[PDB]
């Protein structure tokens, strides 16, 4: 009956809470208290990239630490080179209300997705100067928030109707559908070893999913409002999440609970995007008013501040070898710090 | 010059040419948002403004006085709308459509107006407001089967505004009720305004033909009041 099911659910929740409190013998901020801080870190814009017309919504670093992508709400996907700050390719999108983009792991395709429940995939080596369109993956009821490529023939998508999905491009039909959420989802990242991934939605929830089985392996709580950014720590055994109440947190999977918390007493502006460093020592976040903040990911302190924007920060990424950091905001300018 | 620099310069030049061409086209066209209720009658004015000419969003285009307008109707989404409105924080105006003939839902429509008005990312956009289905309200209050006082008390203590203009030759009670509703909306509109954004109420019914012109005039006033604050 319904009452018996509710009682069983409450008892299992009590059991899980007791189990999670059993192994909470320490906190991250207590063990790494004696690690030498990186000190004062400042970075002057080395190149300044211009050309857009409106808000900037997504940005992904190429496999080479040389190429770049930018994606805006005026109807533009621009493929950049960062050395000579030269524009290499321009692709006019079909839909303009678009919120995600990505490179292929071998630098051959790109993908984009917007409010229309569609993920459009283009290929780069084409005889025409155009980057032609080759695929459209469809089957959601809502809007897409992010998309990443496991390899050149298996991709992953998350939408705002409680679901996630794994897809095989050549045929164009889901292989497995990931359900178990309650609200709309915002961001997923792929495991370094390419076997799992994780997801966060607008609840107090983030989940760790296997890929080829479909069964959901872990569930995490903690946040007071929606969730806006997530990624992978390099060894594929941690993550950090940011929320729309001005708070970041850091979890480790096997511990199955939050380890450390990033907050300040005078921040009342939320978070938009987050990324890690290539050595596991810089955590870089874009906040709600006009700033980016670079954090030392083991101390919950502020290593440095990045300014120069006249509006909100929404995109942040690091190179594939430690060469720069790109930030993008509603002021229509990307900036490359080194 | 080496080949690499040749290719880089040619590519950057061509792409900058294209983007410079596209700037004017992006700035030439105006963008609007459309909100309303299920019984409100959105599609009615959508057809009336198409006269002026699966998927998660729908588009409509029209042309008034050599100026183009794009409306973005939202369908095939869910009933939580606190995340896909954020992307509409750079548009000229919001068309809010409400019905004037059902007292069980007028409070909900008022709450919707309250919610849109006080939003952080929407504190710079004007609201054009359409009261619709007036004839049904007239028939309802003329029949007298049920009273507006059943749901709205202070109607027992209200006199017609001194600047009310009942042109078509209507009964006084019709004018009383109309101005009661309009004052209910404008009370919210003037409670916390700050000279940046203003409402623009209107009176219309399902058989109107002059809605896009009203949108035109409010948009013109908005653009004018914007220039006189960035230059002078």
């Amino acid at each position: 009956e319904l009452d018996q099911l509710r009682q069983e659910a409450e008892q299992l929740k009590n059991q899980i809470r007791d189990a999670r409190k059993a192994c909470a013998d320490a906190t991250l901020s207590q063990i790494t208290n004696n690690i030498d801080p990186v000190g004062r870190i400042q970075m002057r814009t080395r190149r300044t990239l211009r050309g857009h017309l409106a808000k900037i919504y997504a940005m992904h670093w190429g496999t080479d630490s040389r190429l770049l992508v930018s994606a805006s709400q005026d109807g533009k996907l621009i493929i950049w080179d960062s050395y000579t700050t030269n524009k290499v390719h321009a692709i006019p999108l079909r839909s303009s209300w678009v919120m995600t983009c990505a490179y292929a792991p071998s630098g051959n395709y790109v993908a984009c997705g917007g409010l229309d429940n569609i993920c459009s995939i283009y290929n780069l080596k084409t005889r025409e100067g155009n980057v032609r369109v080759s695929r459209e993956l469809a089957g959601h009821t809502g809007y897409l928030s992010c998309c990443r490529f496991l390899d050149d023939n298996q991709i992953v998508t998350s939408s705002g109707d409680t679901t996630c999905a794994l897809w095989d491009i050549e045929t164009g039909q889901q292989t497995t559908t990931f359900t178990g959420h309650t609200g709309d989802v915002m961001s997923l990242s792929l495991a370094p070893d390419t076997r799992l991934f994780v997801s966060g939605a607008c609840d107090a929830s983030a989940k760790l999913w296997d890929v080829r089985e479909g069964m959901c392996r872990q569930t995490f709580t903690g946040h007071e409002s929606d969730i806006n950014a997530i990624c992978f720590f390099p060894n594929g055994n941690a993550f950090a999440t940011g929320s729309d109440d001005a708070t970041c947190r850091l979890f480790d999977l096997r511990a199955d609970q939050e380890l450390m918390t990033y907050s300040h007493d005078n921040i009342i502006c939320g978070i938009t995007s987050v990324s890690f460093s290539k050595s596991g020592r810089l955590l870089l976040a874009g906040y709600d008013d006009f700033n980016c903040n670079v954090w030392d990911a083991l101390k919950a302190d502020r290593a440095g501040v990045l300014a120069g924007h006249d509006n909100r920060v929404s995109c942040l990424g690091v190179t594939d070898d430690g060469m720069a950091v790109a930030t993008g905001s509603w002021d229509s300018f990307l900036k490359i710090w080194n | 010059l080496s080949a690499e620099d040749k290719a880089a310069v040619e590519r950057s030049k061509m792409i900058e040419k294209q983007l410079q061409k596209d700037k004017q086209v992006y700035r030439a066209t105006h963008r609007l948002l459309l909100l309303g209720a299920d019984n409100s009658g959105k599609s009615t004015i959508v057809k009336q403004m198409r006269i002026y000419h699966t998927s998660g969003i729908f588009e409509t285009k029209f042309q008034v006085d050599k100026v183009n307008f794009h409306m973005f109707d939202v369908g095939a989404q869910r009933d939580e709308r606190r995340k896909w409105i954020q992307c509409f924080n750079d548009v000229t105006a919001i068309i809010f459509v409400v019905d004037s003939s059902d007292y069980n839902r007028l409070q909900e429509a008022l709450n919707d107006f309250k919610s849109i008005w006080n939003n952080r990312w929407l504190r710079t956009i004007s609201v054009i407001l359409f009261l619709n289905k007036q004839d049904l309200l007239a028939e309802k209050v003329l029949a007298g089967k049920s009273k507006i006082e059943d749901y709205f008390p202070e109607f027992a203590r209200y006199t017609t505004p001194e600047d009310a203009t009942p042109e078509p030759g209507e009964d006084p009670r019709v004018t009383r009720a109309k101005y009661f509703i309009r004052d209910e909306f404008l009370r919210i509109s003037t409670a916390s305004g700050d000279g940046r954004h203003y409402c623009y109420p209107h009176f219309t019914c399902s058989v109107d033909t002059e809605n896009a012109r009203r949108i035109f005039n409010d948009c013109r006033d908005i653009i004018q009041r914007m220039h006189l604050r960035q230059y002078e």
Partner: nanobody
Amino acid sequence: QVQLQESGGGLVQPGGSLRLSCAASGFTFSNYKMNWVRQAPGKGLEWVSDISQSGASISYTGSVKGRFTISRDNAKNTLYLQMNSLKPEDTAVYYCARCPAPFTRDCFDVTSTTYAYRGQGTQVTVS
């Protein structure tokens, strides 16, 4: 996570005074706008009352313009509705709704079909 639990249902004949309470846990309740919504049998979701951060701004509904009271405690973390003289047209179940975001005055989607931050409901039948 998010906990909203109601209290104060029952059945009564017309002319009764009741006290609906809703307790919250799982956030800092000092700075969140709150509301009361209800659903009557066979009806949808309709809004009853609203109250802001500190307690200086109070608002109600015309249908209940003279009968009800909306109060709150930011120390006992509880939202209250108070009723004095009821009607047979008020049989429903009551939910207390939290606002989505903190530190802000606009409030979206508390009347939605499914909502992450809404309680279970309490039954009130007057006949």
